[PDB]
Amino acid sequence: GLPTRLPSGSQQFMTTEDEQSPNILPGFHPSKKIHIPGMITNVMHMARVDSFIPINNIQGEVGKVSMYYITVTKKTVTERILVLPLEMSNTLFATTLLGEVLNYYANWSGSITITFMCVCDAFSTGKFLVAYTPPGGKLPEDRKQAMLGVHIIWDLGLQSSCTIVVPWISSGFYRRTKADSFTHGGYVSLWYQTAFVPPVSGGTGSILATCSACPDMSVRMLRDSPMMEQKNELQ
Amino acid sequence: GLPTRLPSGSQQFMTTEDEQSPNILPGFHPSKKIHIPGMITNVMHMARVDSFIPINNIQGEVGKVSMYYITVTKKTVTERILVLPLEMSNTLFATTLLGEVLNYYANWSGSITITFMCVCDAFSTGKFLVAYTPPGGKLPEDRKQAMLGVHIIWDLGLQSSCTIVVPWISSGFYRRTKADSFTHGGYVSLWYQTAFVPPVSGGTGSILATCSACPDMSVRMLRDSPMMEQKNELQ
Amino acid sequence: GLPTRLPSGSQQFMTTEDEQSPNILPGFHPSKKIHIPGMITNVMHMARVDSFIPINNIQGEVGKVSMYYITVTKKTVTERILVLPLEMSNTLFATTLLGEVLNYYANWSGSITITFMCVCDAFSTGKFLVAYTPPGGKLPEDRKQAMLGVHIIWDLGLQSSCTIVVPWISSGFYRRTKADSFTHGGYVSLWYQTAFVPPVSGGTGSILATCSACPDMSVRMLRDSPMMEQKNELQ
Amino acid sequence: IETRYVYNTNTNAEADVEMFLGRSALWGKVTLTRQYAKWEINFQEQAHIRKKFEFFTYLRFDMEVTIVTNNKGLMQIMFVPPGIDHPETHDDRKWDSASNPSVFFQPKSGFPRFTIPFTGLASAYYMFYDGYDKPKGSDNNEYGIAPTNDMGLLCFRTLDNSGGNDVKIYVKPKHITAWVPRPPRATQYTHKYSTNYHYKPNSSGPDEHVLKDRHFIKTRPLISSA
Amino acid sequence: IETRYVYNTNTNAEADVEMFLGRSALWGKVTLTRQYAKWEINFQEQAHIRKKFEFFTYLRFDMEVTIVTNNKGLMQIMFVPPGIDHPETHDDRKWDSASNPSVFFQPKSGFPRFTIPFTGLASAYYMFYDGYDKPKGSDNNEYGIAPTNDMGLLCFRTLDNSGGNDVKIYVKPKHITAWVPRPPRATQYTHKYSTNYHYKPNSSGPDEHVLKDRHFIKTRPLISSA
Amino acid sequence: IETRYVYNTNTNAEADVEMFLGRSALWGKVTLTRQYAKWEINFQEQAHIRKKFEFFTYLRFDMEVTIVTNNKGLMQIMFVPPGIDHPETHDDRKWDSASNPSVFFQPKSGFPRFTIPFTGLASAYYMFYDGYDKPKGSDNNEYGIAPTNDMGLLCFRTLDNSGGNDVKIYVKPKHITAWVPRPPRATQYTHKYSTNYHYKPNSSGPDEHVLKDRHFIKTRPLISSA
Amino acid sequence: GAQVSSVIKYFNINYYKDSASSGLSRQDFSQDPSTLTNPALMSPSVEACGYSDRQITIGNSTITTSLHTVLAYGEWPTYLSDIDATSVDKPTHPETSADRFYTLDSVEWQVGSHGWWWKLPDALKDMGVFGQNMYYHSMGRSGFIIHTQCNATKFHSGALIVAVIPEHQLAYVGGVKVNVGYDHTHPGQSGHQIRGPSQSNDRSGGKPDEDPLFNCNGTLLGNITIFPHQIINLRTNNSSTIVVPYINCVPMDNMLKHNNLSLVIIPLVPLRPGSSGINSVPITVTIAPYKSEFSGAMEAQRQ
Amino acid sequence: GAQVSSVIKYFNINYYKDSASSGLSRQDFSQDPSTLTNPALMSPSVEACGYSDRQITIGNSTITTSLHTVLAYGEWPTYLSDIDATSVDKPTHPETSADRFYTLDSVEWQVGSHGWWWKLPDALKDMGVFGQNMYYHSMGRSGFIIHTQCNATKFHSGALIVAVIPEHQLAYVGGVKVNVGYDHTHPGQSGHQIRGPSQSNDRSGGKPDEDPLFNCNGTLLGNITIFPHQIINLRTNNSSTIVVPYINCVPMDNMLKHNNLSLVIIPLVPLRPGSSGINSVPITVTIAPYKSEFSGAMEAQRQ
């Protein structure tokens, strides 16, 4: 009758295709849909929520709650307190809401948002330099080379100055989630602007850090997250 | 010619599908359709018709007409006369028009309607408490714990008070036909409000019970009724 | 249902066909398209660009930069300096932008454009006869038989007279790219009109030649260019 | 042309007689031994589909028949209308018929399907018929619905033997009109076309003639303790 | 009729829950040994697809099931709705069902596909359920989502044995509605329907009862040197 | 709806970059030995199709992939997006993926075809890239277009062994946008991702290290005598 | 193709051009949208449609009782009219001579009495000029009015189920495959006393099933309420009335071979005497042919 | 077929005539075209919708603190209303007698204290006439207001995470396949002190997981911020308030069997005394049932 043709890719079965299918159980009446609080229509809105970065992950501290905070004390000369190499495949970011939404997608774009929170007493005071070195730069090794990039001065007694927004600085339009020398995104490092001055000598600070996506974050090419592995069948 | 594609589920044969088919015997003229009394367009309207519950089903009484009625006498203290655990898979309900329409469907909703009828002489009189304990409650064990649920006082000499309407009280929207602890529907029990007083000491009452669906009863997911089994071929 | 028919050539797979195909990776967002200089929408526009003909290709000169230029001196009698047999399969043309675009196509049409450029000092002067003998004619062997075809007098000290436009003179509408006696396109030869007169006896001229397509050039029937061969796998 | 709105689903649309009986179920199994098989069309054989039609005293429906075979290579089905002789074997001259409708198929291509409209002859099918075909004194009286109709029969042959012998006939009542409702059957069928429920388990030896109901009612230890 | 404009792609359209979960993934593998196979429908078995549904506390979705088999010649699938007994073997009388929906196919023709609408009974599926089916004193309490539903089961038989035994069930959540977001799981699943992550590697001999987390966090030599 | 007039053919419509590069050509061959095969997607392997893309410095195109296999009975292809680990064998647990797109087919039914849109990450593909991925002092610097992208890879397994082992991947650039024109290559490729033309014929013994151009220019006895 | 002459439209199309080739049947609408009970079942009250047709008197015989009449399938009996009829031949209407109340032999209702049934029209075959018109005509159709009347005192007790089963097909008394005999399912006016169940019940000549619980056909009592029925409770009412139209697929059938109704009376609860000494009470049945039609006159089919 | 009732149009068509047979779901438009954040997540400030509903006083008990209240999922608690409800039966609203602040046993926060959790409604089961209405009713729904208050001096240090997890399903303490016991996940008001992790933790009777880092369910802390939460930093604020609506698939559930919330309090950074000598500080929790509804009254489900 009608001259149809079946091209290549007709009798194919593609996992990712979109096709209508016959309904077994016809006339079945689905139970009514009430109003449940918290509907989420998109999985990037999970990446938008702050989540603590395991900034202390070392031999002893991994697997414990102490893996989330860094100890700062008063020191005579500036030191480099912390370095957060910017990759969504790295344990620092990969284990957060941001990084573990982005490890389903093969590359991304937009700005990271990194907030710091110091847990100390009310009498302590400090000035910290938070510096993002763009792609292509070395990790600074001293504060005079860290200050020449993007940086903010995080001052205690404000907590409006905590958040640094890692800008999007890239050649290409997207950055690969898996760290590689071509697209590598740079380094966020933490320094002592002045000092952490406790109310009494020998005092101790404790620093936490969070990461979330900025509204211009975007991702593409959904894939298998490295963040799950099944080595034996579930029974 | 025209680029058609055959997706998955094309050359399938699904028992429950809906498809047009060629007519063998074309031009065949069906015999005319007259008016036959009693047309039934839906099988829930059978469930709407009262049908006697085999409320007495025990070792001796099953298989006989006496399986449909309970004997009540005058007793000094209240007793629990009868318990009808509310399940459509239970021999009590499963064998009625209600229960055996509902055993084709994997779960249901709406109200049961239970009517009691006492067969005695005209001089006997009685007050009965008919109590439905909702899902999650224990079977009462005494009348003071039965009265705290849904209940009606069924009085002889009225026969407007016979029917208790089992309300629909459930968490989910549907209740599984096969009894399970999660959806279990509760218990209808019969008690002596006051007494069954015969016209002469030693008198005897006889009680029958019916069950039908309420107009808001609904069912879904047609399945194989447990109420038929073929263990050998019919010849 | 609908009476479709599958003719012959339905389940075929044709390399050169045109058909829509399902998109693996749906919802994938391509990176934005910026403005890159130099867009080329058609491959004939490469054939339009002048390119040097390897007019000196002989035992010693092939593989070196000296393969592109001819030496002319002052001679008492006219000589035939150069012959460019007109074929797009010939090493002369086949290796240029013109000829190597046209070796993908099984036949062509239109006018070739041949420009000559003399590299000498400013004091040298010369008159050259550039003659195209049409299809069917012998290669001239002397200037009086070369002048009777299409010809131009290329004079140094002008460089407006360099370009000869090989006209399209053919029986059929198209000419086969691979040289054959039936469609053969003729001969462009270079002669001494008068002489190449150096500023001092013993002087030496050096002549280069380019070829490009004219705007009425056309090609058809894309094929495998003889200009590439893979004799072993690339690893 | 017409755009014919209906709905997605309504509440009890599972339960209307069109959807209740409108699933294609197996009405019989035959085997191709000798390359020939024959099945007289009836719903009496399969107890589950038989129980559903017997909620109703009268039904008027089309049926579509779908043949599921594990054989291969080619097959013929012949629908033999009533009142003539069907082919008794393969290679029977009666497989050549100018008139009797037949359907060829190659089982590996698809499942053959056709439709038999309502043949009932009575304006509806009797599920239960309380009367006899022959008059009073007649010697052999068939009781019940057996004389009231015959829906034909399906003859099967195999032109290329190849694979398995097992044929399955799935039919779907469609365009159903059901009339007088009846109680669901409480007991396992012991025969075809017969409404009798007494089983008669044994044959050969002693303890014969004790027979069972085979009903679905089961007991409980105490009333009031449930 | 209606022309329904959408777009080609938007920025994060990769990430919306419809596209995130809207790929057809393997929810279970069975083997046809004896010609029979059975699979209770769940996503608990495969850790990768299980981890994605568990970003969300509640899901409401249709599912379409696609059966990829290396067997040949013919097959039957029977979707057994809850609350009845499924066929326990091939050649089981319960493969003849007037009602239970079933699908025949010949694996060399195509891949069979059907749709199971939302059966949840609760208005959404519980991915995580913090409560028990039975009351307090009850002796056997199932904890979690196991009592909250059953999506049915799929019975498989093979009418013509022929090729391989391996069945694969790929299903695609479609028409998804997801509600309460949860942290992604950080640890390898050690059970079904259970949220416990402690592995318990060994059984038979000494050094038993030491058990592992199996998390995905890995260390770095020095903070500040990264 | 829209009626979209074009033409039959125009003069040079053979030569426009859409038709020039718009034929489906073989970009690689693999073998199914062990039932597993793997191919990293590139045009570098086949010298003829490589020479055509290299008239242009930059290309932006979709590609459709068509798999021509002489095997039978069933197959799986898995497109593994960059940045994760592909299945290393058949019967590898990583063939079960909630996310990685994969395509099942039965080679005797048809030829499977899908489309990979433009993944370039740069807004166009580099055919030639004059720069390095790592900075100056870095120890291992990849030169050329190798770091600039990866188009994924295709993993192949066979669920039913049956016939031949030979897979052929034909892809068609479509929706092409080509930018900076370059001279056609005059010399036979000696490597992948590398633009070097020196062949180095021998290895083991003497007369090693003499290497060839392998160009396409051939001589003539006399200028002026042609 | 063809067509024909939460809300989803669809183009109605017959791909195969025919009816009955069409798929399953849904409920159409012409425009967009935007049922629970069937009163025909449930045995209405004969006032639930109209009472103008009804003190009950058919054809020279009187019944004085009629809001408690059940109208079977909510349909009032009526003549075949036309357009539903096969033959054009004008049927005979006997009217008041053959449409009248015929009272049958009373039956003692005792302790242990299992039940009774009568087949119709059969019970009336010897009754009056209705039972004459059966034999002299090929075919016929009739509606009936069954008045069942059992009176005891206020001291007595026990209940009956009076049901009318269309096409009540009896089961053979047990064992092997046998059709019940023509004679045992056509008892006459005396009907059939259900004497079983027992393992000792005689099996010969196709005798019908004696078990009242399974309705003799294998379907439980208590589901017998799906048919038109009344329950006579000696505490409440002494009598019963049921008005059945003509139920059958055919416009007219033989009436000798085909019994299109059955009147079944089952002692649902036994009869217990009170202080009174009366151990048994008569049950009387009075049947009125109503709107009866006969056609195809011949010699009396009587043997 | 059917249909239904850089920019690409498409004809909406159901080839199989049904919903749910349709393909995947996109975002339709009627005419041509020619989103980034969800404020419901991220735990709004209860002023980020409206503050008119709120000095905080429910039902005869007063809290004086309310811009820093987090409104869980940006939804204010409200009664079930209708049309979302299963039963038509009118629920009971106890209002100010059972909707009031119930303060629980304070818990010492020490160095080395791993955390605490309370299940809801369970914690309130013995509290007042809210805890009475649980037992006497089949079902119920309630929204809660959790006020967590821990006060130290300016010399002290350390932070807590106060989070409310819907459907927090505990992991069994290790090894084999066991359901955690009904009793260990229903601790009462005392909640559960997290004493682990260790390899020596007792495994019996289904005891819950003691590891605070994995949230006892196997998901990291620091991702616990996806739930409604507040961080109490003793350098900044001493207290917390969280307003949760009723989260569940069902309109009403049992409240004895199903705990639809969990209040988890984790010492994110330990408690360090300053120059002061105070090594431990009490943490107090005050829960207010809000907009609670009960239906299906019965005998007390109490054992």
Q: Where are the domains of chain D?
A: 1-226
Distance separating alpha carbons of residues B31 and A60, to the nearest angstrom: 89
Cβ-defined contact of G41 to B45 (cutoff 8 Å):
yes
The coordinates were experimentally obtained by: cryo-EM
3-state secondary structure at position E71: coil
Residue type, G119: K
Cis peptide leading into H166, omega within 30 of 0?
no
- Going along G210-303, which residue ranges are E strands? 229-233, 239-244, 261-272, 281-297
Pairing assessment for the beta strands G281-297 and C51-52 based on DSSP bridges: unpaired
Whether residues H98 and H170 share a domain: the answer is yes
Distance CA H183, CA H199 (A): 22
Left, alpha or beta for G167 (phi > 0: left; psi -120 to 50: alpha)? Answer: left
Which chains reach chain F with 3 or more Cβ–Cβ distances below 8 angstroms?
A, C, E
3-state helix, strand and coil shares in percent for chain D, rounded to the nearest 5: 10, 30, 65
Please report the residues numbered 232 through 261 in chain H whose beta carbons come closer than 8 angstroms to any beta carbon of chain A: 233-236, 245-249, 251
**Helical spans, DSSP H, in chain D:** 17-20, 47-53
Of B89, B172, B224, the CB nearest to E122: B172
Tokens of C172: 């059929």
Beta bridge partner(s), residue G116: G193, G265
The structural domain count of chain G equals 2
Clarify whether residues H116 and H218 are in a common domain.
yes
As a whole number of angstroms, the distance between CA A190 and CA C94 comes to 63
Separation between Cα atoms, residue A106 and residue A224, nearest integer Å: 9
For residues H122 and H168, state if they share a domain. Answer: yes
A105-109 and A175-176 strand pairing: antiparallel
Rounded CA-CA distance G200/F4 in Å is 90
Determine the distance in angstroms separating the CA of F109 from the nearest CA of chain E, rounded to an integer.
8
The position carrying tokens 């388990």 is D201
Interface residue of G3, G9, G30 to substitute, partner H, most H CBs within 10 Å: G9
Q: Give G248's contacts (C-beta < 8 A, 6+ positions apart).
A: B36, G141, G258, G260
Q: Within this chain, do residues H263 and H151 fall inside the same structural domain, yes or no?
A: yes
Place of tokens 């416009």: G251
Q: Are strands C125-133 and A13-14 parallel, antiparallel or unpaired?
A: unpaired
F73 torsion bin: left (phi>0), alpha (psi -120 to 50), beta (else): left
- Fold adopted by A1-235: Jelly Rolls (2.60.120)
Determine the distance in angstroms separating the CA of A30 from the nearest CA of chain D, rounded to an integer: 9
Domain that holds residue G23: 1-42
- D vs H, Cβ pairs < 8 A, gives 3
Q: What is the CATH number of the domain that holds H281?
A: 2.60.120.20
Q: How close are the terminal C-alpha atoms of chain B, in Å?
A: 54
| Breaks in chain A after residues, C-to-N cutoff 2.5 Å | none
Helix, strand or coil for residue C156? Answer: coil
DSSP state of E211: -
Locate G139 and state its tokens.
Answer: 């075919």
The DSSP call for residue B167 is -
Order of strands, edge to edge, in the sheet holding A125-133?
A80-85, A187-197, A125-133, A150-155
In a shared domain, residues G54 and G101: yes
Contact H254 B172 (CB under 8 A): no
Residue F107 near residue F206 (C-beta atoms within 8 A): no
Residue with the two structure tokens 């940045």: F83
CA closest to A26 among chain D residues: D14
DSSP assignments along C65-78, one per residue = GGGG-EEE---SS-
Ordered DSSP codes for B106-133? EEEES-EEEEEEEE--TT-EEEEEEEEE
What is chain C's percent helix, strand, coil content, to nearest 5? 10, 30, 60
Question: How far apart (Å, rounded) are the C-alpha atoms in residues C193 and C143?
Answer: 8
Q: Among all residues of chain C, which has the CA nearest to that of G21?
A: C1
Contact H4, G9 (CB under 8 A): yes
Q: Does D64 touch chain B (CB under 8 A)?
A: yes
- The alpha-carbon gap from A118 to the nearest alpha carbon of chain E, in Å, equals 17
G229 & G253 share domain: yes
CB atoms within 10 A of CB F34: 11
User: Reading across the β-sheet that carries E102-105, which strands appear in turn?
Assistant: B13-14, E102-105, E75-80, E153-157, E36-40
**φ and ψ at residue D5, rounded to 5 degrees:** -70, 140
Please state the φ and ψ torsions of residue E37, each to the nearest 5 degrees.
Answer: -150, 150
CB within 8 Å of F1: residues ≥ 6 apart: none
The reply to whether omega before H197 is within 30° of 0 (cis) is yes
Return residues 119-158 of D near B (CB < 8 Å): 119-124
Number of H helices, E strands in chain E: 2, 9
Residue C215's alpha-carbon distances to C133, F56, G161, in angstroms, are 22, 21, 105
How far apart CA G238 and CA G162 sit, in angstroms, is 12
Contact criterion met (CB < 8 Å) for G172 and D198: yes
Are E96 and D46 inside 8 Å of each other by CB? yes
Contacts of F101 in chain C (CB under 8 A): 24-25
* Cα separation, B74 vs B76, whole angstroms: 7
Q: How far apart are alpha carbons A232 and B39 in whole angstroms?
A: 59
Which residue in H113, H43, H149 sits closest to H268, CA to CA?
H113
Alpha-carbon distance of F81 to F151, in angstroms, equals 8
AA identity, residue G295: S
Contact (CB<8Å) B9/E110: yes
Inspect the interface and report whether the beta carbons of B8 and E111 lie closer than 8 Å. Answer: yes
Q: Tell me, rounded to whole angstroms, the distance of Cα A192 from its chain centroid.
A: 23
Please list the residues that pair with G160 across neighbouring strands.
G232
User: Which residue, B187, B21, B184, is CA-closest to B107?
Assistant: B184
The helix, strand and coil proportions of chain H, stated in percent and rounded to the nearest 5, come to 5, 30, 65
Q: What is the resolution of this structure in A?
A: 3.2
Which residue has tokens 């023509």?
Answer: G182
Same domain? G3 vs G67: no
Q: E64 vs chain A: nearest CA distance in angstroms?
A: 7
Q: Which helix (H) or strand (E) holds C47?
A: helix C44-47
The Cβ-side half-sphere exposure at H10, using a 13 Å CA radius, reads 12
Break chain A into its structural domains and give their ranges.
1-235
Do the strands H239-244 and F153-157 form a parallel or antiparallel pair, or are they unpaired? unpaired
Classify the phi-psi angles of F186: left when phi > 0, otherwise alpha if psi is within -120 to 50, otherwise beta.
alpha
Instruction: Return phi, psi of residue E147, to 5°.
Output: -70, -20
Residues G152-172, buried b or exposed e (16+ Cβ, 10 A)?
beebbbbbbbbbbbbbbbbbb
Looking at the complex, does the CB of residue E106 fall below 8 Å from at least one CB of chain D? Answer: yes
The values of phi and psi at residue E59, to 5°, are -130, 145
The answer to whether the beta carbons of residues E15 and A219 sit under 8 Å apart is yes
Q: Which of G279, G259, G290 is nearest to G143 (CA)?
A: G290
Shortest CA gap C15–chain B (Å):
16
Contacts G24 to B, Cβ<8 Å: 18
Name A62's Cβ contacts closer than 8 Å, sequence gap at least 6.
Answer: A54, E217, E218, E219
Return the HEC string of chain A: CEEEECCCCCCCEECCCCCCCCECCCCCCCCCCCCCCCCCCECHHHHCCCEECCCCCCCCCCCCHHHHCEEECCCCCCCEEEEEECCCCCHHHHCCHHHHHHCCEEEEECCEEEEEEEECCCCCEEEEEEEEECCCCCCCCCHHHHCCCEEEEEECCCCCCCCEEECCCCCCCCEECCCCCCCCCCEEEEEEEEEEECCCCCCCEEEEEEEEECCCCEEEEECCCCCCCCCCCCC
- DSSP annotation string for G58-115: ETTEEE----S-EEGGG-------SSS-S--SPPB--GGGTSS-EE---EEE-TT---
- As a whole number of angstroms, the distance between CA H74 and CA G45 comes to 58
Alpha helices in chain G (DSSP H): 130-135
Residue C40, chain G, CB below 8 Å: the answer is no
A50–H14 CB contact, under 8 Å: no
Running DSSP on this structure, what letter comes out for residue H65? Answer: -
What gap in Å lies between CA F54 and CA F180, rounded to an integer?
10
A103's CB contacts (< 8 A; 6+ apart) are A88, A89, A94, A177, A225, A226, A227
Angle at C91 between CA C90 and CA C95, to 5 degrees: 115
Collapsed DSSP state (helix, strand, coil) of residue G214: coil
Amino acid at D176: I
Q: Which residues contact H150 (CB under 8 A, 6 or more apart)?
A: H109, H160, H232, H234, H238, H239, H281, H282, H283, H284
Residues H172 and E196: beta-carbon distance below 8 Å: yes
The domain E1-226 having CATH identifier 2.60.120.20: the answer here is yes
Contacts of G7 in chain H (CB under 8 A): 4-5
| SS3 category, H132 | helix
* Alpha-helical segments (H) within C103-207: 143-146
Q: Are F52 and C43 in contact (CB under 8 A)?
A: no
The Cα of A12 is separated from the nearest Cα of chain F by a number of Å equal to 5
Separation between Cα atoms, residue H244 and residue H223, nearest integer Å: 19
C-alpha dihedral, G178 to G179 to G182 to G185, nearest 10°: 100
- Work out the minimum CA distance from F69 to partner chain C, whole angstroms: 12
CA distance H209 to H229: 21
Instruction: Say yes or no: H19 and H145 in one domain.
Output: no
The DSSP annotation for C201-226 comes to TT--EEEEEEEEE-TT-EEEEE---T
Query: Which residues, in sequence order, are bridge partners of residue G149?
Result: G239, G284
CA A227 distance to own-chain centroid: 14
Chains C and D touch (3+ CB pairs under 8 A): no
CB B130 within 8 A of CB B81: no
